[PDB]
Amino acid sequence: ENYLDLFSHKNMKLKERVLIPVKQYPKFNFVGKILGPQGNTIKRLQEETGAKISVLGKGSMRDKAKEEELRKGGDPKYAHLNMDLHVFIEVFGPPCEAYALMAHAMCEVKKFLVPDMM
């Protein structure tokens, strides 16, 4: 019920929402650096880690105007635009794989979100 069964036919899901730390680094352009030109960084990042990774929340499109318009329209696909800016990592698999994927993704995302580390 709350146990993991290694022989289960269902994959497990792990999901996390990691705050982009704008408080600690007020002028650093996290959205630009994560997405990359054309979104190639985030594309590479998902390919290398095997996770779904998304930037969401106020500022995720950088374009205060387009964000305003899409919130205002009330469409639920855009409900996230009200949330604090954050990275949403989602993985699926049997336990061993799912944890390994999340671990990989989480550690790569840390590299972007603590940009002055080491």
Smallest distance from Li ion to CB 11, Å = 25
CA distances for 44 relative to 40, 50, 111, angstroms: 6, 10, 14
CA distance 113 to 98: 22
Q: Does residue number 22 form part of the binding site for Li ion (CB under 5 A)?
A: yes
Q: What span, in angstroms and rounded, lies between the C-alpha atoms of 49 and 34?
A: 14
Residue 52 lies near a copy of itself (rule: CB under 8 A): no
Residue number with the shortest CB distance to Li ion? 22
106 binds Li ion (CB under 5 A): no
What is the size of the binding site for Li ion (CB under 5 A)?
A: 2
> Contact with Li ion (CB under 5 A): which of 12, 28, 58, 100?
28
- In sequence order, what are the beta bridge partners of 93? 12
